[PDB]
Design a protein around this ligand. Structure first.
Ligand SMILES: Nc1ncnc2c1ncn2[C@@H]1O[C@H](COP(=O)(O)OP(=O)(O)OP(=O)(O)O)[C@@H](O)[C@H]1O
Ligand SMILES: [Ca+2]
Ligand SMILES: [Ca+2]
Ligand SMILES: [Ca+2]
Ligand SMILES: [Ca+2]
Ligand SMILES: [Ca+2]
Ligand SMILES: [Ca+2]
Ligand SMILES: [Ca+2]
Ligand SMILES: [Ca+2]
Ligand SMILES: [Ca+2]
Lengths: 226, 355
């Protein structure tokens, strides 16, 4: 009986069963109207729910919350609830049958190039993809990898960006071009941050005493896990 | 045609176009007097802050900020753009009227709207009910909101925010034998604060750790190549938000103002507020603040109470981003004051159309 609306950019689009909520998206579940399409009697507690996917960004969230406000505006007896992926109330979970799937419709906001300049941590793998050609400098790729001792591999170089502290970890079996590219990446991050960071190049097995404790805290504390 | 969003802060102007994911102009809310605005004034005069503790107090200087925003930063003709403006909680009625009169009579905008900052942040988090902690450069507010409307009797205000934390870090670094006088140097301390400071989960335990090892020490390289080291300064400085007595203020810290605000609200919505604390503003960016707030509210609240702190990663610009989202939706712009309605009714229209 309930009407379920999917935020798509600045649009609300109605969807039908089966409901597969994308975890990067926002749905508005309208439980405010009686079978025929008329507003429900305030005695029957009309409700509107805003379901927030765990990966949904501010535009999808704001479009969905404003859409619920607009339903409340036309019928003030409506009660609005926000539900969060994986912690939905027993009541919401009673009125819609749904599953949650991995997926993300991009929001409508246009991307502008501004650095928020807030503490963020990342680990990068620095590797040449073809050593058969006799150079370790011509096919360098930089991939983000999870912040963890588990991502460290002897064969490559890793840049551990702890914002103000930057470590270049040299695998004992890594190549010269990966060391050069690793150090150049650390230098670029240091330069972007007006040179305030401390930059260290460390070798595998010869890590300073603080090193692996520092890697654990970065993984726990990383304010933007992505 | 694209609406403009201008979020006027005590410390910084955030401005840009509805539909962008971030403000294109961010500059200091400073005027030097015949007019230097922003970084141009902070390098060259007597400098005045037109906005104090979030409320506009100098209308000649504010006009000039808006002028600088329109023509120099955004390079736009304001007569061609509907303009969303933001205001602080508890903005006096005469202030909103003057804001409306200036936008229409001086800058001739086709349409305008004034939104409460905290409300824009709450929408950006996907909520219409909740309590916002908004902490910027000049003021901190607790703003409880029910289905889109701030509850003015329950708003709490703390005249302590990022500039005071910067001043405190400058004081204690100066006592250790560093000196900050130059434009650079006052901006260096702010950069140290933003890069190295954090909120301790347990302040006494952190002090003990810092007294007994060097594991909390961090270095910072100055522009000349000289290195600074700090340890317990990193967490003593934002601890001031929870203990304002650190800077000689006898007043409640932000965890107590949150609790006090929630307690001024109808008992019926309290459970919803506890579960929907949204943080916004640059001074909520410290690592650890969300976890500390969770621990402090848990200690104050009933033992059964479900507590949740929402701290989106983009929250330094949540207000502006909320404005940019809402100013983009047709249903929202239908609510704005048109130039025709202003001429027909005058500045007092703002109270009927904008709340
Ligand atoms: N990562 C960070 N850590 C700590 N403080 C920060 C960070 N980024 C910005 N700040 C501080 O936030 C303040 C600016 O925040 P904001 O723009 O929300 O304030 P505002 O709107 O100008 O002020 P107000 O709301 O008090 O009128 C400055 O004091 C700045 O130093
Ligand atoms: Ca999405
Ligand atoms: Ca209602
Ligand atoms: Ca409710
Ligand atoms: Ca190669
Ligand atoms: Ca090759
Ligand atoms: Ca390799
Ligand atoms: Ca450096
Ligand atoms: Ca990260
Ligand atoms: Ca502000």
């Amino acid at each position: 009986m309930v009407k379920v609306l999917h935020v798509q950019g600045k649009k609300l689009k109605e969807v039908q069963s089966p409901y597969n909520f994308l975890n990067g998206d926002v749905y508005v579940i309208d439980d405010s109207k009686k079978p025929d399409g008329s507003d429900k009697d305030p005695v029957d507690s009309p409700k509107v729910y805003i379901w927030l996917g765990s990966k949904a960004y501010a535009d999808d969230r704001g479009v969905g919350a404003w859409a619920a406000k607009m339903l409340d505006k036309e019928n003030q007896a409506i009660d609005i609830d926000t539900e969060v992926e994986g912690k939905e109330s027993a009541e919401f979970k009673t009125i819609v049958d749904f599953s949650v799937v991995e997926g993300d419709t991009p929001g409508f906001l246009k991307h502008v190039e501004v650095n928020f300049q807030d503490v963020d941590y990342e680990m990068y793998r620095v590797y040449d993809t073809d050593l058969s050609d006799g150079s370790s400098s011509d096919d360098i790729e930089i991939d983000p990898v999870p912040l963890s001792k588990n991502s460290l591999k002897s064969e490559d170089v890793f840049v551990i960006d702890g914002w103000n502290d930057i470590y270049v970890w040299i695998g004992s079996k890594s190549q010269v071009g990966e060391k050069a590219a690793g150090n150049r990446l650390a230098r670029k991050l240091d330069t972007e941050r007006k040179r305030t960071p401390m930059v260290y190049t460390v070798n595998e097995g010869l890590e300073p005493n603080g090193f692996f404790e520092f890697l654990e805290k970065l993984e726990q504390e990383d304010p933007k896990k992505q | 045609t694209t609406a403009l969003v201008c979020d006027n802060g005590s410390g910084l102007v955030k401005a840009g176009f509805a539909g962008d994911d971030a403000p294109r102009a961010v500059f200091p809310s400073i005027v030097g007097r015949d007019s230097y605005v922003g970084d141009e004034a902070q390098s060259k005069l007597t400098l005045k802050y037109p906005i104090e503790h979030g409320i506009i107090t100098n209308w000649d200087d504010m006009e000039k900020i808006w002028h600088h925003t329109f023509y120099n930063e955004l390079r736009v003709a304001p007569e061609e753009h509907p303009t969303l403006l933001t205001e602080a909680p508890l903005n006096p009625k005469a202030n909103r009227e003057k804001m409306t009169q200036i936008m229409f009579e001086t800058f001739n905008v086709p349409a305008m709207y004034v939104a409460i900052q905290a409300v824009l942040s709450l929408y950006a988090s996907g909520r219409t009910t909740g309590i916002v902690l908004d902490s910027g450069d000049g003021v901190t507010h607790n703003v409880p909101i029910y289905e889109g409307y701030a509850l003015p009797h329950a708003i709490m205000r703390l005249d302590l925010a990022g500039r005071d934390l910067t001043d405190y870090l400058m004081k204690i670094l100066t006592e250790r034998g560093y000196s900050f006088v130059t434009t650079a140097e006052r901006e260096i301390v702010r950069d140290i604060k933003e890069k190295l400071c954090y909120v301790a989960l347990d302040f006494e335990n952190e002090m003990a750790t810092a007294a007994s090892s060097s594991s909390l020490e961090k270095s910072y390289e100055l522009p000349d190549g000289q290195v600074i080291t700090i340890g317990n300064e990193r967490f003593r400085c934002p601890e001031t938000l929870f203990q304002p007595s650190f800077i000689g203020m006898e007043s409640a810290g932000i965890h107590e103002t949150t609790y006090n605000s929630i307690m001024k609200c109808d008992i019926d919505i309290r459970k919803d507020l506890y579960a929907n604390n949204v943080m916004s503003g640059g001074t909520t960016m410290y690592p650890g603040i969300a976890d500390r707030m969770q621990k402090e509210i848990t200690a104050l609240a009933p033992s059964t109470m479900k507590i949740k702190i929402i701290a989106p990663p983009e929250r330094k610009y949540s207000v502006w981003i909320g404005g940019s989202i809402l100013a983009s939706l047709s249903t929202f712009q239908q609510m704005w004051i048109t130039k025709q309605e202003y001429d027909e009714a005058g500045p007092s229209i703002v109270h009927r159309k904008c709340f």
